């Protein structure tokens, strides 16, 4: 059982990249396809963030970082906001939150 | 978007029912099949508990119930313990934790 | 095994709830996202209805309730009609059919 | 869409029977377990395809023309569930026999 | 297991082309969206089946006997990706044409 | 689109880690659970390797690296061999092959 927040980051990066491409194309088919892919990719990023909190992070980590529980919840809600938006900024906000989890993850691995 | 912890409870009930049936049969094939089904069912219960915490529960719920973040994490770890055990008691412990989430869920719906 | 038509009902209620929301929100992005969600929720509802018919209901139940076979086929088709529609009444027709299966299910539990 | 074929159900059921046959040859505990995992997934996929034909392809007049179809499909699904829980190739064959009966009715509905 | 068949790839690719054809008839925004969702899922499943044949069925001497197979399979997958992004039935047909070429090589490996 | 062989590497590392754990824990229940986990992790690794070959790598990359087609087929087969084995060396062979794809991938990003 190997863990890495890179899995959440890669899927969230895809969400932002899809949002950016939606602003440069008018086509109803492309807009629909991009919305389908974004939905799937965002749900996968949420799954990876959830698994880290559920299976990797243990009681001493929640004691050492009392803000971790809320950070992970805020990340999931940021990803949910990105899932329902075409705005690349919401995709970036989700990535900013994942970056904070990534920092904490590696501090617990040292 | 409808939510109900019954989805987590039904899948966790299946996990306990599978654990109980493992004590009454010696057969290597049945033991293997039951282990495969238990793994799948436990992961589904974990997914349903995760979705409630991620998508249903909002900031005022975490403020009103300061123990909710840790209750949900303890539930996931209890389900993970049940996933790796043949003991029906570990399956019951997971159900006891889901019952506490179910009580809080309905209090937020009133 | 542990069975309950509540699994089918919850997914079917989600389909109707998505249909209700589509009626009051004109946004093309939301309309597309709602269509993706409705498609998978209806497919999940169909899975649950199918499982009860194949795995729970045995030959004595089909003998006592001769219309059960056709009721389940009608329910599945009503769910496919709901999957292809934005109208809440189609989601309600599928829920009315699940309510008929739910009634029969509990009579066999007594 | 409109593109359905019992071959999807048959291929997955053939895989179930093929796995049951391979289990009798190799006694290795790891292979026995891997085979059980694959059989479980393949059997549920065979069940999905059979159920899809019954609900999505077959229409109401097909059930009037073939009053046995409802019961035949249920027996196929139960036969597949029996195969899922067994290492015996005979159970996998029973599921294939039932699928062969659905296949016959399918191609008749394609002609008239 | 040992039970493989290009029909699985073909049926899913036929569903992709059938959806592309249905999109030209009904202009309803809800149907256009539902069709796009189904096409995306069906196209990825067609890609999975083609990739499985290439890695799990086809063995090393098959690539010596058919030096074009590696490139043919990649072109099939790319043709399917093109169909996934288009409403045009001609793209779905191109994917089926490539699958027909894989199908021919498959049945030759079953004979000798 | 956003691609990275890290997705294939992480799943492949999980396969090797499960193989390592199977070597030091005799329990039949754990052995079965580990086999289920290893089976899906290897299948996910195969999916990722296949996606890079079909969706990322284009005709100029196959022209510049003539052995890339066979390298990817060998990697997928090594992963299937790892899926059917408890030996960590098979998991490592699949990781060595992914490392060769990773090297080529980054050279095309420059």
């Amino acid at each position: 059982g190997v863990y890495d927040p890179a899995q959440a980051r890669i899927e969230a990066e895809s969400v932002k990249a899809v949002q950016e491409k939606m602003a440069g194309n008018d086509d109803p088919h492309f807009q629909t396809r991009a919305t389908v892919i974004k939905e799937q990719r965002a749900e996968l990023a949420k799954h990876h963030v959830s698994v880290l909190w559920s299976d990797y992070f243990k009681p001493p980590h929640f004691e050492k970082y009392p803000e971790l529980h809320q950070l992970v919840n805020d990340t999931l809600k940021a990803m949910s906001a990105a899932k329902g938006s075409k705005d690349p900024a919401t995709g970036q906000k989700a990535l900013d939150y994942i970056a904070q989890i990534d920092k904490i993850f590696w501090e617990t691995k040292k």
Side-chain angles (χ1 to χ4, degrees), chain A:
Chain A
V2 175
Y3 296 103
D4 203 322
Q7 293 194 284
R9 178 169 61 247
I10 295 159
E11 297 298 330
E13 217 107 77
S14 299
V15 173
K16 198 202 167 179
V18 166
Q19 288 174 325
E20 295 176 330
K21 287 194 169 187
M22 285 181 97
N25 205 329
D26 57 271
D27 191 49
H29 189 54
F30 185 77
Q31 284 285 303
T32 305
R33 281 195 65 244
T35 302
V36 174
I37 295 164
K38 179 161 68 72
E39 201 73 20
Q40 169 78 299
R41 260 46 233 178
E43 216 60 63
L44 269 167
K46 285 173 76 182
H47 175 72
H48 290 305
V49 171
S50 181
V51 174
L52 288 168
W53 184 71
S54 176
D55 310 345
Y56 178 77
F57 289 122
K58 307 294 184 183
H61 300 150
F62 299 125
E63 202 85 69
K64 190 172 178 180
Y65 305 89
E67 81 291 351
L68 189 54
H69 278 311
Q70 192 60 57
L71 178 66
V72 174
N73 203 264
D74 288 353
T75 301
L76 294 173
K77 285 181 169 60
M79 272 304 331
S80 285
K83 192 175 76 175
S85 177
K86 291 188 280 189
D87 188 2
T90 63
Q92 185 57 53
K93 189 137 282 298
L95 283 159
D96 292 340
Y97 274 112
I98 290 167
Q100 297 182 58
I101 301 174
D102 187 84
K103 186 184 181 180
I104 290 173
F105 176 87
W106 290 111
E107 284 184 359
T108 62
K109 272 276 195 167
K110 291 293 158 294

